[PDB]
Amino acid sequence: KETAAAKFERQHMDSSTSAASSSNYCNQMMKSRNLTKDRCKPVNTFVHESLADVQAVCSQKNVACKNGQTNCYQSYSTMSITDCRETGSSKYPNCAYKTTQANKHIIVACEGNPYVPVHFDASV
Template sequence: MALKSLILFSLLVLVLLVLEGAQPSLAQDFQRKHIDTSNGPFGRHYCNQMMRRRNLLSRTFNTFVHASLAAVQAVCREPNIRCKNGRNNCHRSRNQMSITDCILTRRYPIPNYKTINRKKFIIIACLGNQLYFDQWV
């Protein structure tokens, strides 16, 4: 009976490990949604291409930061500031960063996004290894 329980427990652990490996980490998810290390400025078709390529067509608004994930994660080492939701786990980038905002202008028949290139300070909410855009200023 103990051997049977050990085998079942081992199989359960194996399944959980496989499921964990199949799901992207939170940093990978942030990277997919918001990081593009390409240099801009970008033309008017950039957002249509990127939103399609990154499978983000359900979003009405998205911001891409043109920096490495490490550079964005480094913002979490800046002093804490108050987030829009009132929490104190936000951090403002020390320097302005190149960003591109993608704003949905038409959903049907084919989604169309307006591309806006900017240089802004970004504000990131940091929770452990999780990153969230709070805003840019």
């Protein structure tokens, strides 16, 4: 079935655009990446850097994950991200999102051989 690594890419990678400069971006992307299929995924971040750059974070600053696991990593540089957060009037299946562009350090959980991002933990 879909690998954890591929699912991270689907949920969190958007290297095509340098920043999400449409107010529509989250509405469209959350839909087209299948994050509105069974429910409205409430919060989700997209990263606008190369895959190589994001994968490389697994070799950067080791930090605790929010769930208490130890396999999280914080990017030494800031990265261009977009935060998508479901609006108060959003109702499945017409999931509605606020789009916020930022430049922040990402924190991702990594696992496997090869050791790759499998979860987006936080941005700081």
